[PDB]
Amino acid sequence: NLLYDSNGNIIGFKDFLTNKTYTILPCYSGRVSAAFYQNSSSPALLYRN
Amino acid sequence: WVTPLSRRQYLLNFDEHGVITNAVDCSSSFLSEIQCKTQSFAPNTGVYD
Amino acid sequence: HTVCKSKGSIRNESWHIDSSEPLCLFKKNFTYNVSADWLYFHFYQERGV
Amino acid sequence: VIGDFNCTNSFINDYNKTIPRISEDVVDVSLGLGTYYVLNRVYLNTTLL
Amino acid sequence: LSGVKPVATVYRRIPNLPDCDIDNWLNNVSVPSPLNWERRIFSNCNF
Ligand SMILES: *[C@@H]1O[C@H](CO)[C@@H](O[C@@H]2O[C@H](CO)[C@@H](O)[C@H](O)[C@H]2NC(C)=O)[C@H](O)[C@H]1NC(C)=O
Ligand SMILES: *[C@@H]1O[C@H](CO)[C@@H](O[C@@H]2O[C@H](CO)[C@@H](O)[C@H](O)[C@H]2NC(C)=O)[C@H](O)[C@H]1NC(C)=O
Ligand SMILES: *[C@@H]1O[C@H](CO)[C@@H](O[C@@H]2O[C@H](CO)[C@@H](O)[C@H](O)[C@H]2NC(C)=O)[C@H](O)[C@H]1NC(C)=O
Ligand SMILES: *[C@@H]1O[C@H](CO)[C@@H](O)[C@H](O)[C@H]1NC(C)=O
């Protein structure tokens, strides 16, 4: 009922109630790089990639 | 027939369809220990302690 | 002891005596190949499981 | 001696010629005999230790 | 800079005990008389 990889994580499973398969995808969690001058109101944001 | 069990370490090989092809007991011979420490069935050329 | 159900025996099946249904934690039936020649099982425990 | 309840005492004797036998075969995990799959995990085209 | 837990949860687990099947016994074609009032004890099951 579960799908695992060589690294040890889970990347999929199967539902026993509806007989449908899925692929578990990791969710986004990143930071923002902001450039700020000496005296400014708001800095300039940059979402990398 | 009954035989005792012990906490061992084995190496499993999975094919495209997820069927176990062969297994190697890491406490059988020295080549088995090499395959255990290299995490592969075709270890490279080198000196292993 | 276990009493044969195909050809019978001289004794009666008696391995437990319970007037009412005792407290059970697991109960499930499984099916296997009747025309099989050999069967293999694995039983072990760790951390109380 | 397993239990502590008297259930049947029809024919009980003391047989002293019952000795378990030792098989002539050994454990061979080369082709996969003696190994069990994971609980509910699937591995495709991987080598897991 | 800085780099929330939704309340939506998915809980799936295979049961270890069979169903009680109380509706099958209550909807039986045989209805006992008030003098009989047959009794069936249900234990170690899920409902
Ligand atoms: C999911 O697949 C399983 C496997 O085929 C289905 O179980 C079968 O159900 C039919 C219909 O009752 C039975 O005749 C078979 O004997 C069952 N097979 C097994 C191995 O149990 C199951 O019904 C499917 N579930 C859904 C929601 O489609
Ligand atoms: C698993 O199978 C066994 C044997 O087929 C079932 O035991 C039977 O239970 C019924 C109902 O209590 C009795 O009338 C039979 O006499 C029992 N047979 C034997 C050989 O003891 C058991 O009920 C099954 N378990 C489940 C959960 O279905
Ligand atoms: C199964 O795994 C093997 C090993 O990773 C894969 O073989 C590699 O395939 C890539 C892409 O074709 C090549 O660049 C590598 O050189 C191959 N390595 C070896 C050692 O042969 C194989 O492609 C995988 N098969 C499937 C269906 O995913
Ligand atoms: C059960 O085993 C016999 C003998 O090994 C085989 O002929 C038969 O096909 C098996 N049953 C199933 C359903 O595979």
Side-chain angles (χ1 to χ4, degrees), chain A residues 1-6 8 10-49, chain B, chain C, chain D, chain E residues 1-4 6-47:
Chain A
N1 297 326
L2 299 180
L3 179 61
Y4 282 70
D5 67 330
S6 180
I10 173 174
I11 56 180
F13 76 104
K14 180 183 179 180
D15 190 9
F16 65 98
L17 293 177
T18 59
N19 291 19
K20 297 186 299 180
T21 60
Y22 297 90
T23 54
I24 295 185
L25 200 65
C27 299
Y28 169 78
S29 60
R31 304 189 304 179
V32 188
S33 300
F36 186 64
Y37 204 19
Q38 177 68 21
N39 183 21
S40 180
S41 60
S42 300
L45 304 179
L46 172 57
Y47 297 85
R48 293 184 177 270
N49 302 93
Chain B
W1 305 105
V2 178
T3 175
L5 265 60
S6 300
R7 183 180 180 91
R8 303 297 173 86
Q9 192 174 20
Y10 278 59
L11 187 62
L12 306 184
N13 181 86
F14 298 93
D15 67 333
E16 183 181 0
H17 299 269
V19 182
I20 299 180
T21 300
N22 46 15
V24 176
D25 185 11
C26 295
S27 300
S28 60
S29 60
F30 292 136
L31 177 56
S32 300
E33 186 178 359
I34 295 181
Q35 296 180 358
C36 219
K37 67 179 301 180
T38 197
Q39 204 177 359
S40 180
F41 289 82
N44 302 330
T45 302
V47 180
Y48 302 93
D49 194 359
Chain C
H1 61 270
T2 304
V3 170
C4 256
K5 298 183 60 59
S6 300
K7 299 179 180 299
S9 179
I10 194 60
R11 288 179 170 268
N12 300 330
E13 181 180 0
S14 300
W15 56 274
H16 76 286
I17 166 66
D18 290 316
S19 60
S20 60
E21 182 179 0
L23 194 150
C24 304
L25 298 180
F26 180 81
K27 181 179 181 180
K28 186 179 300 180
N29 279 19
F30 301 93
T31 59
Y32 60 92
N33 187 17
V34 184
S35 300
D37 300 330
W38 296 85
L39 287 78
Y40 307 94
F41 302 89
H42 288 251
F43 299 101
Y44 65 96
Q45 62 178 358
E46 51 179 0
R47 294 183 296 269
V49 184
Chain D
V1 77
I2 281 80
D4 59 330
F5 190 84
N6 184 22
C7 332
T8 168
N9 49 15
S10 300
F11 299 92
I12 298 180
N13 60 330
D14 298 329
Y15 198 81
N16 202 21
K17 297 184 299 180
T18 300
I19 166 73
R21 301 179 295 101
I22 302 180
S23 63
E24 301 179 0
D25 299 359
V26 298
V27 181
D28 180 70
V29 300
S30 61
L31 299 180
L33 180 60
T35 314
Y36 53 88
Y37 280 109
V38 208
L39 294 81
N40 48 18
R41 314 181 184 177
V42 190
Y43 299 97
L44 294 83
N45 195 20
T46 52
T47 302
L48 183 135
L49 184 59
Chain E
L1 301 179
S2 300
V4 56
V7 299
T9 58
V10 180
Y11 182 83
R12 302 299 178 89
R13 181 173 298 182
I14 300 179
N16 300 330
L17 300 180
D19 191 73
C20 300
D21 297 327
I22 308 180
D23 53 354
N24 298 120
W25 183 71
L26 297 180
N27 302 331
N28 186 22
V29 300
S30 60
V31 177
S33 60
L35 185 60
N36 300 120
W37 48 281
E38 302 178 0
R39 173 181 299 180
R40 174 173 294 184
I41 301 180
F42 299 92
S43 60
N44 302 119
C45 63
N46 299 120
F47 63 97

Short mmCIF file of all heavy atoms in Angstrom, two decimals, chain C residues 2-41:
data_model
loop_
_atom_site.label_atom_id
_atom_site.label_comp_id
_atom_site.label_asym_id
_atom_site.label_seq_id
_atom_site.Cartn_x
_atom_site.Cartn_y
_atom_site.Cartn_z
N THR C 2 -4.64 -31.31 18.30
CA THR C 2 -5.44 -31.01 17.11
C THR C 2 -6.01 -32.31 16.56
O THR C 2 -5.30 -33.31 16.44
CB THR C 2 -4.59 -30.31 16.04
OG1 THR C 2 -4.00 -29.13 16.60
CG2 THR C 2 -5.45 -29.92 14.85
N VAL C 3 -7.30 -32.28 16.21
CA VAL C 3 -8.02 -33.45 15.72
C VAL C 3 -8.20 -33.32 14.22
O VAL C 3 -8.56 -32.25 13.72
CB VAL C 3 -9.37 -33.61 16.43
CG1 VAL C 3 -10.22 -34.68 15.76
CG2 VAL C 3 -9.16 -33.95 17.90
N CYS C 4 -7.93 -34.41 13.50
CA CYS C 4 -8.12 -34.43 12.05
C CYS C 4 -9.58 -34.21 11.70
O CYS C 4 -10.48 -34.82 12.29
CB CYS C 4 -7.64 -35.76 11.48
SG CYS C 4 -6.05 -35.69 10.63
N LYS C 5 -9.83 -33.32 10.74
CA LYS C 5 -11.17 -33.05 10.25
C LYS C 5 -11.47 -33.72 8.92
O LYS C 5 -12.64 -33.75 8.51
CB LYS C 5 -11.40 -31.54 10.12
CG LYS C 5 -11.29 -30.78 11.43
CD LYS C 5 -11.60 -29.30 11.23
CE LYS C 5 -13.01 -29.10 10.71
NZ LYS C 5 -14.03 -29.66 11.63
N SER C 6 -10.46 -34.27 8.24
CA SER C 6 -10.69 -34.94 6.97
C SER C 6 -11.08 -36.40 7.18
O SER C 6 -12.06 -36.88 6.59
CB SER C 6 -9.44 -34.85 6.10
OG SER C 6 -9.09 -33.50 5.84
N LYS C 7 -10.34 -37.12 8.02
CA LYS C 7 -10.62 -38.52 8.30
C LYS C 7 -11.07 -38.76 9.74
O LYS C 7 -11.38 -39.90 10.09
CB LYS C 7 -9.38 -39.38 8.01
CG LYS C 7 -8.92 -39.33 6.56
CD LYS C 7 -7.68 -40.18 6.35
CE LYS C 7 -7.22 -40.14 4.90
NZ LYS C 7 -8.25 -40.67 3.97
N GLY C 8 -11.12 -37.72 10.56
CA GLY C 8 -11.54 -37.87 11.94
C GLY C 8 -10.43 -38.42 12.82
O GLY C 8 -9.31 -38.68 12.40
N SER C 9 -10.78 -38.60 14.10
CA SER C 9 -9.85 -39.15 15.08
C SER C 9 -10.65 -39.73 16.23
O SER C 9 -11.88 -39.69 16.25
CB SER C 9 -8.87 -38.08 15.57
OG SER C 9 -7.97 -38.62 16.53
N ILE C 10 -9.92 -40.29 17.20
CA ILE C 10 -10.57 -40.88 18.37
C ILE C 10 -10.80 -39.85 19.47
O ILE C 10 -11.68 -40.05 20.32
CB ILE C 10 -9.74 -42.06 18.90
CG1 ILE C 10 -10.55 -42.90 19.89
CG2 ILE C 10 -8.45 -41.57 19.54
CD1 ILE C 10 -11.81 -43.49 19.29
N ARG C 11 -10.07 -38.75 19.47
CA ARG C 11 -10.20 -37.71 20.49
C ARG C 11 -11.00 -36.53 19.95
O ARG C 11 -11.29 -36.43 18.75
CB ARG C 11 -8.82 -37.25 20.97
CG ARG C 11 -8.09 -38.26 21.83
CD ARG C 11 -6.72 -37.72 22.24
NE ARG C 11 -6.09 -38.55 23.26
CZ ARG C 11 -6.20 -38.35 24.57
NH1 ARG C 11 -6.93 -37.34 25.02
NH2 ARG C 11 -5.59 -39.15 25.42
N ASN C 12 -11.34 -35.62 20.85
CA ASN C 12 -12.05 -34.40 20.52
C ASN C 12 -11.11 -33.21 20.64
O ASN C 12 -10.21 -33.19 21.48
CB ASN C 12 -13.27 -34.20 21.43
CG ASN C 12 -14.27 -35.33 21.33
OD1 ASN C 12 -14.40 -35.96 20.28
ND2 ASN C 12 -14.98 -35.59 22.42
N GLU C 13 -11.33 -32.21 19.78
CA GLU C 13 -10.49 -31.02 19.77
C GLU C 13 -10.69 -30.24 21.07
O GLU C 13 -11.78 -29.71 21.32
CB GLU C 13 -10.81 -30.15 18.56
CG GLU C 13 -9.97 -28.89 18.46
CD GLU C 13 -10.31 -28.05 17.24
OE1 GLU C 13 -11.20 -28.46 16.48
OE2 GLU C 13 -9.68 -26.99 17.05
N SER C 14 -9.64 -30.16 21.88
CA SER C 14 -9.72 -29.48 23.17
C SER C 14 -8.38 -28.81 23.43
O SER C 14 -7.43 -29.46 23.89
CB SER C 14 -10.09 -30.45 24.29
OG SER C 14 -11.34 -31.06 24.05
N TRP C 15 -8.30 -27.51 23.14
CA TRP C 15 -7.12 -26.71 23.45
C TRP C 15 -7.42 -25.46 24.25
O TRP C 15 -6.48 -24.82 24.73
CB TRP C 15 -6.39 -26.32 22.16
CG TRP C 15 -7.24 -25.58 21.17
CD1 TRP C 15 -8.05 -26.13 20.22
CD2 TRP C 15 -7.35 -24.16 21.02
NE1 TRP C 15 -8.67 -25.14 19.49
CE2 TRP C 15 -8.25 -23.92 19.96
CE3 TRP C 15 -6.77 -23.07 21.67
CZ2 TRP C 15 -8.59 -22.63 19.55
CZ3 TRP C 15 -7.11 -21.79 21.26
CH2 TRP C 15 -8.01 -21.59 20.21
N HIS C 16 -8.69 -25.09 24.42
CA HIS C 16 -9.07 -23.96 25.25
C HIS C 16 -10.49 -24.18 25.76
O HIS C 16 -11.30 -24.84 25.10
CB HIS C 16 -8.98 -22.63 24.49
CG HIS C 16 -10.11 -22.41 23.53
ND1 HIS C 16 -10.21 -23.08 22.33
CD2 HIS C 16 -11.18 -21.58 23.60
CE1 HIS C 16 -11.30 -22.68 21.70
NE2 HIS C 16 -11.91 -21.77 22.45
N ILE C 17 -10.77 -23.62 26.93
CA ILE C 17 -12.09 -23.73 27.55
C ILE C 17 -12.55 -22.32 27.91
O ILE C 17 -11.98 -21.68 28.81
CB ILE C 17 -12.08 -24.64 28.79
CG1 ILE C 17 -13.36 -24.46 29.62
CG2 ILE C 17 -10.82 -24.42 29.63
CD1 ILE C 17 -14.61 -24.92 28.91
N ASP C 18 -13.55 -21.82 27.19
CA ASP C 18 -14.09 -20.48 27.41
C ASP C 18 -15.60 -20.53 27.21
O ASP C 18 -16.07 -20.83 26.12
CB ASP C 18 -13.45 -19.47 26.46
CG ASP C 18 -11.99 -19.20 26.78
OD1 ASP C 18 -11.66 -19.03 27.97
OD2 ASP C 18 -11.18 -19.16 25.83
N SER C 19 -16.34 -20.22 28.28
CA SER C 19 -17.80 -20.19 28.17
C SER C 19 -18.26 -19.03 27.30
O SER C 19 -19.18 -19.18 26.48
CB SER C 19 -18.43 -20.12 29.55
OG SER C 19 -18.01 -18.95 30.24
N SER C 20 -17.65 -17.86 27.46
CA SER C 20 -17.96 -16.68 26.68
C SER C 20 -16.77 -16.30 25.80
O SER C 20 -15.67 -16.86 25.93
CB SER C 20 -18.34 -15.50 27.59
OG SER C 20 -17.29 -15.18 28.47
N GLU C 21 -17.00 -15.35 24.91
CA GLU C 21 -15.94 -14.90 24.01
C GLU C 21 -14.96 -14.01 24.77
O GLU C 21 -15.37 -12.95 25.28
CB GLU C 21 -16.55 -14.14 22.83
CG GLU C 21 -15.52 -13.66 21.82
CD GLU C 21 -16.16 -12.94 20.64
OE1 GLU C 21 -17.40 -12.82 20.62
OE2 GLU C 21 -15.42 -12.50 19.74
N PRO C 22 -13.69 -14.38 24.87
CA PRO C 22 -12.73 -13.55 25.60
C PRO C 22 -12.37 -12.30 24.82
O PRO C 22 -12.74 -12.12 23.66
CB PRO C 22 -11.52 -14.48 25.77
CG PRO C 22 -11.60 -15.40 24.60
CD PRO C 22 -13.07 -15.61 24.34
N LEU C 23 -11.61 -11.42 25.48
CA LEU C 23 -11.19 -10.18 24.86
C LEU C 23 -10.12 -10.46 23.82
O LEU C 23 -9.09 -11.07 24.12
CB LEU C 23 -10.67 -9.21 25.93
CG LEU C 23 -10.47 -7.74 25.55
CD1 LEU C 23 -10.68 -6.86 26.77
CD2 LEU C 23 -9.08 -7.50 24.96
N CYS C 24 -10.36 -10.02 22.58
CA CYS C 24 -9.45 -10.25 21.47
C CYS C 24 -8.93 -8.92 20.94
O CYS C 24 -9.63 -7.90 20.96
CB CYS C 24 -10.13 -11.02 20.34
SG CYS C 24 -10.85 -12.60 20.83
N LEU C 25 -7.68 -8.93 20.48
CA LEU C 25 -7.05 -7.75 19.89
C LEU C 25 -6.93 -7.81 18.38
O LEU C 25 -6.88 -6.76 17.74
CB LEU C 25 -5.66 -7.53 20.50
CG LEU C 25 -5.61 -7.27 22.00
CD1 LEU C 25 -4.18 -7.07 22.47
CD2 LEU C 25 -6.47 -6.07 22.37
N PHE C 26 -6.88 -9.01 17.80
CA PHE C 26 -6.77 -9.16 16.36
C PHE C 26 -7.54 -10.40 15.93
O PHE C 26 -7.50 -11.43 16.61
CB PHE C 26 -5.30 -9.27 15.91
CG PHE C 26 -5.13 -9.43 14.43
CD1 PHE C 26 -5.18 -8.33 13.59
CD2 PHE C 26 -4.90 -10.68 13.88
CE1 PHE C 26 -5.02 -8.48 12.22
CE2 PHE C 26 -4.74 -10.84 12.52
CZ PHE C 26 -4.80 -9.74 11.69
N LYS C 27 -8.24 -10.29 14.80
CA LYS C 27 -9.02 -11.42 14.28
C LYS C 27 -9.22 -11.20 12.79
O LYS C 27 -9.92 -10.26 12.39
CB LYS C 27 -10.36 -11.53 15.01
CG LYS C 27 -11.22 -12.70 14.55
CD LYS C 27 -12.52 -12.76 15.33
CE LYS C 27 -13.37 -13.94 14.88
NZ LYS C 27 -14.65 -14.02 15.64
N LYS C 28 -8.62 -12.06 11.98
CA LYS C 28 -8.73 -11.96 10.53
C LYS C 28 -8.36 -13.30 9.91
O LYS C 28 -7.47 -14.00 10.40
CB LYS C 28 -7.83 -10.85 9.97
CG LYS C 28 -8.00 -10.58 8.49
CD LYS C 28 -7.09 -9.45 8.02
CE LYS C 28 -7.38 -8.16 8.77
NZ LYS C 28 -6.49 -7.05 8.33
N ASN C 29 -9.06 -13.65 8.84
CA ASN C 29 -8.86 -14.91 8.13
C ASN C 29 -8.11 -14.67 6.83
O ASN C 29 -8.34 -13.67 6.14
CB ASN C 29 -10.20 -15.60 7.84
CG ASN C 29 -10.73 -16.36 9.04
OD1 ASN C 29 -10.32 -16.13 10.18
ND2 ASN C 29 -11.64 -17.29 8.78
N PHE C 30 -7.21 -15.59 6.50
CA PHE C 30 -6.44 -15.54 5.27
C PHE C 30 -6.60 -16.86 4.52
O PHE C 30 -6.90 -17.90 5.11
CB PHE C 30 -4.96 -15.27 5.54
CG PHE C 30 -4.70 -13.98 6.26
CD1 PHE C 30 -4.59 -13.96 7.65
CD2 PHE C 30 -4.56 -12.79 5.57
CE1 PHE C 30 -4.35 -12.77 8.32
CE2 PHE C 30 -4.32 -11.60 6.24
CZ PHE C 30 -4.22 -11.60 7.61
N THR C 31 -6.39 -16.80 3.21
CA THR C 31 -6.52 -17.95 2.33
C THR C 31 -5.20 -18.20 1.61
O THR C 31 -4.50 -17.25 1.25
CB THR C 31 -7.65 -17.76 1.31
OG1 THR C 31 -7.38 -16.60 0.52
CG2 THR C 31 -8.98 -17.60 2.02
N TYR C 32 -4.88 -19.47 1.39
CA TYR C 32 -3.68 -19.88 0.69
C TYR C 32 -4.03 -20.96 -0.33
O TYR C 32 -5.19 -21.39 -0.44
CB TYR C 32 -2.60 -20.37 1.66
CG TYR C 32 -3.00 -21.56 2.49
CD1 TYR C 32 -2.73 -22.86 2.07
CD2 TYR C 32 -3.66 -21.40 3.71
CE1 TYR C 32 -3.10 -23.95 2.83
CE2 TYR C 32 -4.03 -22.48 4.48
CZ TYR C 32 -3.74 -23.76 4.03
OH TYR C 32 -4.11 -24.84 4.79
N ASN C 33 -3.03 -21.39 -1.08
CA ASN C 33 -3.22 -22.41 -2.11
C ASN C 33 -3.34 -23.78 -1.46
O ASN C 33 -2.43 -24.21 -0.73
CB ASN C 33 -2.07 -22.38 -3.11
CG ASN C 33 -2.30 -23.29 -4.29
OD1 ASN C 33 -3.42 -23.73 -4.55
ND2 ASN C 33 -1.23 -23.59 -5.03
N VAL C 34 -4.45 -24.47 -1.72
CA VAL C 34 -4.67 -25.78 -1.11
C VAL C 34 -3.73 -26.81 -1.73
O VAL C 34 -3.23 -27.71 -1.04
CB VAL C 34 -6.14 -26.20 -1.26
CG1 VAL C 34 -6.40 -27.52 -0.56
CG2 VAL C 34 -7.06 -25.11 -0.72
N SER C 35 -3.46 -26.70 -3.03
CA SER C 35 -2.60 -27.64 -3.73
C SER C 35 -1.12 -27.34 -3.57
O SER C 35 -0.30 -27.86 -4.33
CB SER C 35 -2.96 -27.67 -5.22
OG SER C 35 -4.31 -28.07 -5.41
N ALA C 36 -0.75 -26.51 -2.60
CA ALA C 36 0.66 -26.18 -2.38
C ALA C 36 1.40 -27.37 -1.77
O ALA C 36 0.80 -28.28 -1.19
CB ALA C 36 0.79 -24.95 -1.49
N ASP C 37 2.72 -27.34 -1.89
CA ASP C 37 3.58 -28.40 -1.37
C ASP C 37 4.30 -28.00 -0.09
O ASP C 37 4.40 -28.81 0.84
CB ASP C 37 4.61 -28.81 -2.42
CG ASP C 37 3.97 -29.32 -3.70
OD1 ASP C 37 2.86 -29.89 -3.62
OD2 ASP C 37 4.57 -29.16 -4.78
N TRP C 38 4.81 -26.77 -0.01
CA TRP C 38 5.53 -26.30 1.16
C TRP C 38 5.09 -24.89 1.50
O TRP C 38 4.75 -24.10 0.61
CB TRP C 38 7.05 -26.34 0.94
CG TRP C 38 7.60 -27.71 0.73
CD1 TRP C 38 7.66 -28.40 -0.45
CD2 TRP C 38 8.17 -28.57 1.72
NE1 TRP C 38 8.23 -29.63 -0.25
CE2 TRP C 38 8.55 -29.76 1.07
CE3 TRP C 38 8.39 -28.45 3.10
CZ2 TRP C 38 9.14 -30.83 1.75
CZ3 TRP C 38 8.98 -29.51 3.77
CH2 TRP C 38 9.35 -30.68 3.09
N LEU C 39 5.09 -24.57 2.79
CA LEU C 39 4.72 -23.25 3.28
C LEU C 39 5.85 -22.69 4.13
O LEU C 39 6.56 -23.43 4.82
CB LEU C 39 3.42 -23.29 4.09
CG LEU C 39 2.10 -23.49 3.35
CD1 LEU C 39 1.89 -24.95 2.96
CD2 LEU C 39 0.93 -22.98 4.18
N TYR C 40 6.02 -21.37 4.07
CA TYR C 40 7.05 -20.68 4.82
C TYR C 40 6.43 -19.53 5.60
O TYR C 40 5.55 -18.83 5.09
CB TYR C 40 8.15 -20.15 3.89
CG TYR C 40 8.74 -21.20 2.98
CD1 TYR C 40 8.26 -21.38 1.69
CD2 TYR C 40 9.79 -22.01 3.40
CE1 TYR C 40 8.79 -22.34 0.85
CE2 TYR C 40 10.33 -22.97 2.57
CZ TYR C 40 9.83 -23.13 1.30
OH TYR C 40 10.36 -24.09 0.47
N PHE C 41 6.90 -19.33 6.83
CA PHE C 41 6.39 -18.28 7.69
C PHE C 41 7.54 -17.60 8.41
O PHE C 41 8.61 -18.18 8.59
CB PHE C 41 5.39 -18.83 8.73
CG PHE C 41 4.20 -19.53 8.12
CD1 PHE C 41 4.25 -20.88 7.84
CD2 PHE C 41 3.05 -18.83 7.83
CE1 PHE C 41 3.16 -21.53 7.29
CE2 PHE C 41 1.95 -19.47 7.28
CZ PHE C 41 2.01 -20.82 7.01
#
